[PDB]
Design an enzyme around this catalytic site. Structure first.
Site, PDB file in Angstrom:
ATOM      1  N   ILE A  15       0.678  -1.258   0.000  1.00 33.00           N
ATOM      2  CA  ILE A  15       0.000   0.000   0.000  1.00 33.00           C
ATOM      3  C   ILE A  15       0.716   1.327   0.000  1.00 33.00           C
ATOM      4  CG2 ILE A  15      -2.008  -1.443   0.800  1.00 33.00           C
ATOM      5  CD1 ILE A  15      -1.441  -0.235   3.637  1.00 33.00           C
ATOM      6  N   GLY A  16       2.041   1.166   0.051  1.00 29.67           N
ATOM      7  CA  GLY A  16       3.050   2.192   0.136  1.00 29.67           C
ATOM      8  C   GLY A  16       4.505   1.797  -0.327  1.00 29.67           C
ATOM      9  N   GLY A  18       8.989   3.570  -1.118  1.00 29.44           N
ATOM     10  CA  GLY A  18       9.954   4.655  -1.097  1.00 29.44           C
ATOM     11  C   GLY A  18      11.153   4.128  -0.342  1.00 29.44           C
ATOM     12  N   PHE A  20      13.226   2.486   1.815  1.00 27.78           N
ATOM     13  CA  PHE A  20      13.094   2.411   3.253  1.00 27.78           C
ATOM     14  C   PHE A  20      12.377   1.083   3.308  1.00 27.78           C
ATOM     15  CE2 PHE A  20      14.888   5.387   5.773  1.00 27.78           C
ATOM     16  CZ  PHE A  20      14.314   6.648   5.922  1.00 27.78           C
ATOM     17  N   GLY A  21      11.546   0.852   2.298  1.00 26.93           N
ATOM     18  CA  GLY A  21      10.807  -0.390   2.220  1.00 26.93           C
ATOM     19  C   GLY A  21       9.445  -0.277   1.568  1.00 26.93           C
ATOM     20  N   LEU A  22       8.615  -1.275   1.820  1.00 24.92           N
ATOM     21  CA  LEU A  22       7.275  -1.319   1.276  1.00 24.92           C
ATOM     22  C   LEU A  22       6.302  -1.445   2.426  1.00 24.92           C
ATOM     23  CD1 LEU A  22       7.650  -3.944  -1.572  1.00 24.92           C
ATOM     24  CD2 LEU A  22       7.693  -1.466  -1.836  1.00 24.92           C
ATOM     25  N   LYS A  37       5.238  -2.891   7.681  1.00 27.82           N
ATOM     26  CA  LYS A  37       6.254  -2.051   7.060  1.00 27.82           C
ATOM     27  C   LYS A  37       7.549  -2.853   6.965  1.00 27.82           C
ATOM     28  CE  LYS A  37       6.936   2.807   7.188  1.00 27.82           C
ATOM     29  NZ  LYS A  37       8.087   3.658   6.782  1.00 27.82           N
ATOM     30  N   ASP A 128       7.866  15.908  11.304  1.00 25.84           N
ATOM     31  CA  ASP A 128       7.183  15.705  10.038  1.00 25.84           C
ATOM     32  C   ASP A 128       5.674  15.577  10.261  1.00 25.84           C
ATOM     33  OD1 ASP A 128       7.284  15.549   7.235  1.00 25.84           O
ATOM     34  OD2 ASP A 128       7.592  13.367   7.226  1.00 25.84           O
TER      35      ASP A 128
END
Ligand SMILES: NS(=O)(=O)c1cccc(Nc2ncc3ccc4sc(-c5ccccc5)cc4c3n2)c1
Length: 246
Positions: A15-16, A18, A20-22, A37, A128
């Site tokens: 679902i994501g 970048g 750093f991982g998936l 994650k 952030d």
């Protein structure tokens, strides 16, 4: 490391991403819906992952997303969070635009503020805080995530990279703006330079129509040029809580 997970995980869909991982929607023990994650091999030192996970598991608040555990026997490494049914606050505000009453939107800000007040007291700087880093659970509860972009930066941040809970507060003000504009992009048609100039000259994000004059007032306290002039989240929380009642 409170609870290490092996392979009692079912990865359903990603679902994501970048480096750093998936991120994956999954299930632990064929029962608990979770967001997994995973970290790209060689995209984070092992002590960074380790020290990061311990921090997130040491932190606990009803408005902070919870972790079920972590996977580190290598396969690759990953973190297992509880699954937040409605995704990111930014996406949520945008697709639900026009269906929100002002009370609802203010309620969302209060949720974030409580989690932020908690982190503040725990001497944790978010750095952030934006609507995209907040998650919506079932019943519209908002939880802060990613707790363990000059458009959200306070002056001392784009000038000195000087972070503090007070710079977080400024960020929270912008987040409040995102919430009340129902997911609009702040300073959408302005470059970094233009944002810095406009802000340095005293200009601030316009008042969204759903934002009452009292809500907007609070937004402006968060955007006070001087960190010491901004209220701490602990104080902000009560200010928002009083307005909410009217
Ligand atoms: N994030 S999303 O794709 O909008 C989405 C859609 C539907 C449900 C969720 N639920 C959920 N629940 C708990 C979570 C806790 C950890 C993370 S990290 C992350 C992410 C990171 C980097 C890029 C894109 C997404 C989403 C979630 C997360 N997500 C998220």
């Amino acid at each position: 490391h409170m609870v290490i997970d092996p392979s009692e995980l079912t990865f359903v869909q990603e679902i994501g991403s970048g480096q750093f991982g998936l991120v994956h929607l999954g299930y632990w023990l064929n029962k608990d819906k979770v967001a997994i994650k995973t970290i790209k091999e060689g995209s984070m030192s092992e002590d960074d992952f380790i020290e990061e996970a311990e921090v997130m598991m040491k932190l606990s608040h009803p408005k902070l997303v919870q972790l079920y555990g972590v996977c580190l026997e290598q396969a690759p490494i990953c973190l297992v969070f509880e699954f937040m049914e409605h995704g990111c606050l930014s996406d949520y505000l945008r697709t639900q635009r026009g269906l929100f009453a002002a009370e609802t939107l203010l309620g969302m800000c209060l949720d974030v503020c409580e989690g932020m007040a908690y982190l503040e007291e725990a001497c944790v700087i978010h750095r952030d805080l934006a609507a995209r880093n907040c998650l919506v659970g079932e019943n519209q509860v908002i939880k802060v995530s990613d707790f363990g972009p000059v458009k959200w930066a306070s002056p001392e941040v784009f000038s000195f990279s000087r972070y503090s809970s007070k710079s977080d507060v400024w960020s929270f003000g912008v987040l409040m703006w995102e919430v009340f504009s129902e997911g609009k992009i702040p300073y959408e048609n302005r470059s970094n330079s233009e944002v810095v100039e406009d802000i340095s000259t005293g200009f601030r994000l316009y008042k969204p129509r759903l934002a009452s004059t009292h809500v907007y007032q609070i937004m402006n306290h968060c955007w006070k040029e001087r960190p010491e002039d901004r209220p701490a989240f602990s104080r902000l929380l009560r200010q928002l809580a009083e307005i909410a009642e009217s």
